[PDB]
């Protein structure tokens, strides 16, 4: 049971101001959103359980999230000099929060790792109070975050707002955030080619994620199958199976963390 405020940004050199998109995944389902080109200019509460809360926090949710979006434009004024470019570098600066609590109510371990242009720029560690810059540039950032008690403030935030708010959502979520939707299965013969067939397992609409579906009691996986994590248009996830077996000789693993 986790919680993460994904951030992202892009640049439009010579086209105005940079963008910013953010979301949230209390448990797994998306609940919060933001954009730099939307008309609401506010958080978008598109989740069923988290809607009854008072207007003040819906209005803010640190409405200075916009201030953070305007801080990122200042960050990409020295991130341009670090990976030295001229002015036109179209780049993304992603942000990765995360505050994972234990199922009883403990703090387990919090998470954070930032990256730039798909390359890690700075990250936290298990336990805390450590920086692991991964270039000749962000070593400056690592040493400076060492300078003014940065990880200590991160500890404050994690041991505070993360656990407090997250327990608040689990209280509000009731059973919507914790319902454990199991898969439903179907399969047929599916003859292929001229002398072979495919026995494709199907499982759709289950919740939450982390299902194990792999290929008379062996794992003969030596080829390419399946795309990625697959969203069913509401938050529910699904996976299928693929295999090639000869005609007449056709004779999958079914494991889910919430499997009945």
């Amino acid at each position: 049971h986790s919680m993460r405020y994904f951030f992202t940004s892009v640049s439009r050199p010579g086209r105005g101001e940079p963008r910013f998109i953010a979301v949230g995944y209390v448990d797994d389902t998306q609940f919060v959103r933001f954009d730099s080109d939307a008309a609401s200019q506010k958080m978008e509460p598109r989740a069923p359980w988290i809607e009854q809360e008072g207007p003040e926090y819906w209005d803010q949710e640190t409405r200075n999230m916009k201030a953070h979006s305007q801080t990122d434009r200042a960050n990409l004024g020295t991130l341009r000099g670090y990976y030295n470019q001229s002015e036109d570098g179209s780049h993304t600066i992603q942000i990765m929060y995360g505050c994972d609590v234990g199922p009883d109510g403990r703090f387990l371990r919090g998470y954070r790792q930032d990256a730039y242009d798909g390359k890690d720029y700075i990250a936290l560690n298990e336990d805390l109070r450590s920086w692991t810059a991964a270039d000749m540039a962000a070593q400056i950032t690592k040493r400076k975050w060492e300078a003014v008690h940065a990880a200590e403030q991160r500890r404050v935030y994690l041991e505070g707002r993360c656990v407090d708010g997250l327990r608040r959502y689990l209280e509000n979520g009731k059973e919507t955030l914790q319902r454990t939707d199991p898969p439903k299965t179907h399969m047929t013969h599916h003859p292929i080619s001229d002398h072979e067939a495919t026995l494709r397992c199907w499982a759709l609409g289950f919740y939450p994620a982390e299902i194990t579906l792999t290929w008379d009691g062996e794992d003969q996986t030596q080829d390419t199958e399946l795309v990625e994590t697959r969203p069913a248009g509401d938050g529910t996830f699904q996976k299928w199976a693929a295999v090639v077996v000869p005609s007449g000789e056709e004779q999958c693993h079914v494991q889910h963390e919430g499997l009945p």
Partner: T-cell receptor
Amino acid sequence: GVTQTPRYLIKTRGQQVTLSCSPISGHRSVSWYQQTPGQGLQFLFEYFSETQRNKGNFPGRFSGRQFSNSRSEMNVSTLELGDSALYLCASSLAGDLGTEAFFGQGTRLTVVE
Amino acid sequence: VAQPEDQVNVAEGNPLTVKCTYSVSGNPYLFWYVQYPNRGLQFLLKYITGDNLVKGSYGFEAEFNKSQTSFHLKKPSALVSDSALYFCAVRVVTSGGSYIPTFGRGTSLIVHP
């Protein structure tokens, strides 16, 4: 890690002091001030291209120096009582208009008579 | 560059307000800092150029306004401690840059609960 040394110190009337400020890492700009309640910071000096860049108007006693490896020292040859109360050092990459400098824990050195 | 308020007070029910005035030539640039009691000078508010309602720290902010030639660092809800000698400063462009924190006696907030 803008560590300074010694962190408190005391000296009587008129001698020279050896006060050190150590920057975090590769930077070039060092600034010096005096955070005493009296007067103001007045910006002692900033140092650039192995040369004190910005200079005001002082009696000859005030002076300062840093090292090639960015280590920096203060030297106040003559003390005039209150004029040595509290001192600060700064470090920054290149010291541009849109960039800042970070300060150290200072050199609080409240002086005896 | 000097602001009248040498002492500002507030209770834990009102948004923090301070004064930050300035009058220089060319394009001004303002910096903000805070001096937590007997410690460093880590900043909370930066302005370079661009947007008016400038971003900030844990909830501080300031806005740029020629109609008063000042920022007046604002905060809708100060945190519990936030009791220090806040100050802001400007200095004009020179060869290489000047960027000096010449504030003047700052201002000391107290947050009586």
